[PDB]
Structure formats: structure tokens, C-alpha cells
Amino acid sequence: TNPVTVEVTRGLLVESRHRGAVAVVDGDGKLFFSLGDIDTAVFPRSACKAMQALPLVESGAADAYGFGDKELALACASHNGEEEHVALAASMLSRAGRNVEALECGAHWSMNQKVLIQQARSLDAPTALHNNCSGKHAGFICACCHRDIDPKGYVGYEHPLQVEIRAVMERLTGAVLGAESCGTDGCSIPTYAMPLRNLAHGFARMATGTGLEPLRAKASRRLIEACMAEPFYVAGSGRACTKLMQIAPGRIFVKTGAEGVFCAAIPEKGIGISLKSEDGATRAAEAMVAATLARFFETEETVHAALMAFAAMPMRNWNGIHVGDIRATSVFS
């Protein structure tokens, strides 16, 4: 029965309240911090894209097509459909001998307002390349092509790619990922509900290598380093996931998920983080991931300060007037 994790104030008062759950786990699976119910299956949605990109790396497809940090970042991305994202994804497909028509994710306008205005002014309609999951889906197609697997139907539950992804995520998290746990994601691929505890543990393991074979440990290390090295390619302009990974370069891994999921790691402390705003609000998940991270940087005041700017964000109206704050509650203390 989940505690209030974020308050949203106006004048002297709380106007809105979010409840959520948080799991912080080390490489060995030891629990360092928890809020609310970390045992009920939650859909990680986009928060677990890095786990899904392991096939791209472990298959040798990354090395074969000359993917560096930018390409791997995109594979792990919910991007804004900025031209830089669109041209990188086209490039990943091109090097595999494919193009946009291979994408099975469908098209949508940026979920960033500033980026949508630019799209609206430069395009008649978005393409599948503008889909926030185009880099992941381009990873998928590249993984298939490299291995001589026809990418057609790569979204299918019993396509060999999704078979491999399910086995990989079972191994990382120790969760049972089958029909019971399964739903269709925004891009038409499977997403697998699992306890927050197991999702945090999966991330701790990618972060530490603990419990993984060398190949999976190495491929996990490359994916995380790539996201922290090219955080723009994970999200883009004005995005929480990009800015959070610019506070302490190379030290903090974060990834947003649809419906208020966040995953994080701090490799150097060997911890994985997962959390869920019960109502699925993004603003709550952002404030909660910042408050949770800040616990581990209390001794580093400029990093703590930067994190607290997301844990306690001012809101201004259309005239620029401060009206209240979105703030993580004292349960983070």
C-alpha cells in the first residue's frame, strides 16, 4: 500500500500527490533501500531498453556495422525524434542494407513540445524513424541481419529475436517472463511485468557483472558506458534522462519508462535502482529517481545540489510567475 513519494504544491497547500515504490539493490541482490510494494509485477516499458539491446552487442552486430557510443545509446533510447536521432537510425538500418520500411514500430510526433514545433514546421507527418523507439528497433533489425535472420515480424512473441530477448531478461533479473506477465508495448513489441526488486537486480548485475558470464558482463558494460557517454542519444533536448547523466559524467546511468518507471545504476557503488509512480506520472518518476540518486551523493555537494534541482522542481505559470513546486517527500531522507 504505496507511500506518497511526490507532492505538487500551489500557494500554502499540496494540490496533487503521487504514490510510488522504489527498489535499490547491489550486484549480489542485497536490498539497500525500498519504498512501497517492490514485489508486484510492474511493466518496465522503455526503462529496460538497455537489456533489450544486449542481442545487438552479444551477436557481434554492433562491431560488424561499426556501431560506437552514439549508435548503442540510440539502441537504448526513447528519443525526441530530433533530426540527429532520425539520421543516426537511418544510418544503422542503411549499414545493414535496410531502410525505414523495415521498421514495424509505426510513426508519431515528438513527445517534447519544443521538438514537436520543429517537426511540425519541417515535416508533413512523422516517419517510423521519428518513433521514440526507432533506435531500439534499428538495433533489432541490425541484430537479425548480421545473423542472417529475416527481420520480418521481429516484433512477434515467437520471432527468434523476442525469444532471445526473453531468455536474456530472465537471466539478468531472475524473473519468469511468459504469457501471464506479457503485454504489447507502445511500439508493438512484448513488455514483461516483473517485480521492481528483480528489475533493480537486473540493472545492478549489468552495472557490476556479478552473476553474469563474461560476454554478457562485457556487453552490459559497453551499453551502460555508451548511454553515459552519449546521453543526448538516449533522449535529447530538454529531457530528464539526458540532463541527469550530464551532472556527473560517466558516473550515473538513468532511463525513463512509459507510465512513470525509472531505472538507474551507479556502477562505482555497485547498485541498481528501479521505481514506479503508481499513477504513471513522468513528473513523479523524475523527482523520485533524482531523490533516490541524491541519497548516494550526500558527500558530493555539487552533484547532490544538481540532483535536488530535479527532486524539488519549481513550477512557473505562462507569465513566468512561480506558483509552486513538484517535490519528493521526506521518505527519501
Per CB under 5 A, the segment of 32-40, 128-136, 153-161, 165-173 that binds Zn ion is 128-136
Q: Residue type for 142, please?
A: C
For the chain, the C-alpha Rg in angstroms (whole number) is 19
> By C-beta, is 35 or 207 nearer to Cl ion?
207
Determine which helix (DSSP H) or strand (DSSP E) holds 45, and give its type and residue range.
none
328: three-class secondary structure by DSSP: strand
- Cell matching residue 249: 559524467
Candidates 53, 103, 133, 228; binder of Zn ion (CB under 5 A) is 133
Q: Which does 42 bind (CB under 5 to 8 A by kind): its own copies, Zn ion, Cl ion, none?
A: its own copies
Query: What is the DSSP secondary-structure string of 167-214?
Result: HHHHHHH----SGGGEEE-TTSSEEE-EEHHHHHHHHHHHHH-TTS-H
Selected from 21, 43, 55, 195, the binder of its own copies by CB under 8 A is: 43
Q: How far is the CB of 218 from its own copies (least distance, A)?
A: 33
**How far apart are the C-alpha atoms of 47 and 206, rounded to whole Å?**
14
| C-alpha to C-alpha distance for 96 and 3, rounded to whole angstroms | 48
Backbone angles phi, psi at 322, to 5 degrees: -65, 130
187 annotated as ligand-binding: yes
76 is in an annotated binding site: no
Q: 268-297: which residues touch its own copies (CB under 8 A)?
A: 277-281, 284
Q: Which stretch binds its own copies (CB under 8 A): 69-77, 79-87, 178-186, 302-310?
A: 178-186
Under rule CB under 5 A, which residues in 158-197 are in contact with Zn ion?
185, 187
Residues of this chain that interact with its own copies (CB under 8 A) are: 8, 10-13, 15-19, 41-43, 104-109, 113, 116-117, 120-121, 131, 180-188, 191, 193, 259-260, 277-281, 284, 317-321, 323-324
